Design an enzyme around this catalytic site. Sequence first.
Site, PDB file in Angstrom:
ATOM      1  N   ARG A 133       3.125  -0.060   2.214  1.00  0.00           N
ATOM      2  CA  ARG A 133       2.201  -0.773   3.190  1.00  0.00           C
ATOM      3  C   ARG A 133       2.782  -2.002   3.571  1.00  0.00           C
ATOM      4  O   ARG A 133       2.955  -2.547   2.457  1.00  0.00           O
ATOM      5  CB  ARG A 133       1.123  -0.350   2.780  1.00  0.00           C
ATOM      6  CG  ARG A 133      -0.068  -1.125   3.916  1.00  0.00           C
ATOM      7  CD  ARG A 133      -1.606  -1.221   3.235  1.00  0.00           C
ATOM      8  NE  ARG A 133      -1.851  -2.546   2.342  1.00  0.00           N
ATOM      9  CZ  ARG A 133      -2.934  -2.618   1.683  1.00  0.00           C
ATOM     10  NH1 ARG A 133      -3.982  -1.489   1.638  1.00  0.00           N
ATOM     11  NH2 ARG A 133      -3.121  -3.681   1.037  1.00  0.00           N
ATOM     12  N   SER A 186       2.622  -5.335   6.511  1.00  0.00           N
ATOM     13  CA  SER A 186       1.487  -6.045   7.197  1.00  0.00           C
ATOM     14  C   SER A 186       0.976  -5.606   8.409  1.00  0.00           C
ATOM     15  O   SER A 186      -0.254  -6.094   8.686  1.00  0.00           O
ATOM     16  CB  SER A 186       2.038  -7.551   7.494  1.00  0.00           C
ATOM     17  OG  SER A 186       2.556  -8.330   6.663  1.00  0.00           O
ATOM     18  N   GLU A 204       0.562   1.252   7.117  1.00  0.00           N
ATOM     19  CA  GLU A 204       0.811   2.385   5.882  1.00  0.00           C
ATOM     20  C   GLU A 204       1.617   3.582   6.284  1.00  0.00           C
ATOM     21  O   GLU A 204       1.529   4.218   7.452  1.00  0.00           O
ATOM     22  CB  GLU A 204      -0.475   2.930   5.492  1.00  0.00           C
ATOM     23  CG  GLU A 204      -1.497   2.036   4.857  1.00  0.00           C
ATOM     24  CD  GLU A 204      -2.473   2.742   4.025  1.00  0.00           C
ATOM     25  OE1 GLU A 204      -2.318   3.740   3.473  1.00  0.00           O
ATOM     26  OE2 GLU A 204      -3.812   1.863   3.647  1.00  0.00           O
ATOM     27  N   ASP A 247      12.767  -9.147  11.628  1.00  0.00           N
ATOM     28  CA  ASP A 247      12.099  -9.286  10.503  1.00  0.00           C
ATOM     29  C   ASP A 247      12.891  -8.858   9.246  1.00  0.00           C
ATOM     30  O   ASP A 247      12.641  -7.818   8.577  1.00  0.00           O
ATOM     31  CB  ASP A 247      10.565  -8.652  10.386  1.00  0.00           C
ATOM     32  CG  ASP A 247       9.848  -8.721   9.182  1.00  0.00           C
ATOM     33  OD1 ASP A 247      10.202  -9.547   8.257  1.00  0.00           O
ATOM     34  OD2 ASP A 247       8.763  -8.133   9.068  1.00  0.00           O
TER      35      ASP A 247
HETATM   36  N1  LIG Z   1      11.017   5.762   6.652  1.00  0.00           N
HETATM   37  C1  LIG Z   1      10.412   5.457   5.746  1.00  0.00           C
HETATM   38  N2  LIG Z   1      10.919   6.282   4.642  1.00  0.00           N
HETATM   39  C2  LIG Z   1      10.286   5.799   3.487  1.00  0.00           C
HETATM   40  N3  LIG Z   1       9.482   4.568   3.264  1.00  0.00           N
HETATM   41  C3  LIG Z   1       9.458   3.828   4.206  1.00  0.00           C
HETATM   42  C4  LIG Z   1       9.840   4.327   5.702  1.00  0.00           C
HETATM   43  N4  LIG Z   1       9.394   3.421   6.378  1.00  0.00           N
HETATM   44  C5  LIG Z   1       8.682   2.547   5.615  1.00  0.00           C
HETATM   45  N5  LIG Z   1       8.550   2.958   4.335  1.00  0.00           N
HETATM   46  C6  LIG Z   1       8.070   2.128   3.519  1.00  0.00           C
HETATM   47  O1  LIG Z   1       6.961   1.455   3.986  1.00  0.00           O
HETATM   48  C7  LIG Z   1       7.114   0.016   3.855  1.00  0.00           C
HETATM   49  C8  LIG Z   1       6.186  -0.243   5.371  1.00  0.00           C
HETATM   50  O2  LIG Z   1       6.862   0.365   6.334  1.00  0.00           O
HETATM   51  P1  LIG Z   1       7.137  -0.767   7.456  1.00  0.00           P
HETATM   52  O3  LIG Z   1       7.818   0.006   8.622  1.00  0.00           O
HETATM   53  O4  LIG Z   1       8.180  -1.943   6.714  1.00  0.00           O
HETATM   54  O5  LIG Z   1       5.736  -1.479   7.923  1.00  0.00           O
HETATM   55  P2  LIG Z   1       5.305  -2.878   8.088  1.00  0.00           P
HETATM   56  O6  LIG Z   1       5.981  -3.614   7.007  1.00  0.00           O
HETATM   57  O7  LIG Z   1       3.548  -2.861   8.021  1.00  0.00           O
HETATM   58  O8  LIG Z   1       5.753  -3.281   9.617  1.00  0.00           O
HETATM   59  P3  LIG Z   1       6.074  -4.584  10.192  1.00  0.00           P
HETATM   60  O9  LIG Z   1       5.387  -5.639   9.293  1.00  0.00           O
HETATM   61  O10 LIG Z   1       5.073  -4.602  11.545  1.00  0.00           O
HETATM   62  S1  LIG Z   1       7.584  -5.305  10.817  1.00  0.00           S
HETATM   63  C9  LIG Z   1       8.272  -0.351   3.758  1.00  0.00           C
HETATM   64  O11 LIG Z   1       8.608  -1.416   3.090  1.00  0.00           O
HETATM   65  C10 LIG Z   1       8.872   0.970   2.942  1.00  0.00           C
HETATM   66  O12 LIG Z   1       8.713   0.561   1.502  1.00  0.00           O
HETATM   67 MG   LIG Z   2       7.977  -3.875   6.713  1.00  0.00          MG
END
Ligand SMILES: Nc1ncnc2c1ncn2[C@@H]1O[C@H](COP(=O)(O)OP(=O)(O)OP(O)(O)=S)[C@@H](O)[C@H]1O
Ligand SMILES: [Mg+2]
Length: 336
Positions: free
Chosen positions: A75, A77, A80, A182
Amino acid sequence: EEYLVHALQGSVSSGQAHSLTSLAKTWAARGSRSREPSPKTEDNEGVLLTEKLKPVDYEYREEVHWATHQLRLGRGSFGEVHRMEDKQTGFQCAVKKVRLEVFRAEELMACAGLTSPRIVPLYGAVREGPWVNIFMELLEGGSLGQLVKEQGCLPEDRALYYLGQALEGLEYLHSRRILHGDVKADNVLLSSDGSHAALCDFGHAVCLQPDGLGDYIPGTETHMAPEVVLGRSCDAKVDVWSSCCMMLHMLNGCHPWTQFFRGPLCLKIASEPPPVREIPPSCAPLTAQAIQEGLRKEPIHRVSAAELGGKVNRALQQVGGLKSPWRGEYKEPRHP
Ligand SMILES: Nc1ncnc2c1ncn2[C@@H]1O[C@H](COP(=O)(O)OP(=O)(O)OP(O)(O)=S)[C@@H](O)[C@H]1O
Ligand SMILES: [Mg+2]
């Protein structure tokens, strides 16, 4: 476009990137809208980019046509992320769940249709009212960020290796006029064996207009470049700065700035010399030199992603290639 969108709306269709992208623009507009009453029929629309995710009669609803399993993958910012299974095809992938009110079409625009092995393939996105679901290849090795946390720090060779793959990805993006927005460890995903890396999380992506200049809010404070903080014109170089912050993160087991200053960091990043003092002394000359050229404060002087990719490839050769094991012994991070 306007006619196309009208056709897509209300339905979950198998289709191609542009369709998803075009529909996604409507989602960003609706997320800005005033609070409304929930209807009886919750809108269910989207497009899927692989036949391994199958709509049923133009519908794709969680707990009906698909479901999450097991504990959360991660998860950030904004979203999830979970493992998922399509109930028709049996296919497994990852879902990123984002509220419509914080959604940005650019997150899909920036990676729908792309075909670099350094960028997570996007499998599609559908929305159930205000619940946006973004489907993508599942990577079983977790984030680079998780690895850095577990291991404490990474060996110089692993760090160089992953930084290189990231820069391969950025070069692909940048050449297509896409800014990641980012770049950081948490937004790099790994294989089971830890051999392959791919960029994720295009939530702060911006599509650099033909000018090649940008709208842009940065994703992570510690990894912001000075030109951003100064409120100046921004280009792809923003990402290479970020990648070198990530590099420092991998080596020291902590973000730049953090151990030395209490926030906010805007002032510091603008005021101070670039955090090249955080380059470990034990690093090989070619590593230190790459990091320094990537952390040039004036972006015009900062190296491109391709240029830095070269430097770090040679620096990896200098340390004698990727020798260190995957999930090796713990290394104590730098302390304040
Ligand atoms: N395709 C994927 N496969 C496995 N784990 C993932 C995947 N996408 C994301 N994750 C995990 O979930 C976390 C959050 O996903 P992100 O896409 O980075 O979401 P986020 O950080 O809320 O996005 P921002 O902040 O809007 S750029 C990542 O740091 C990974 O640890
Ligand atoms: Mg992220």
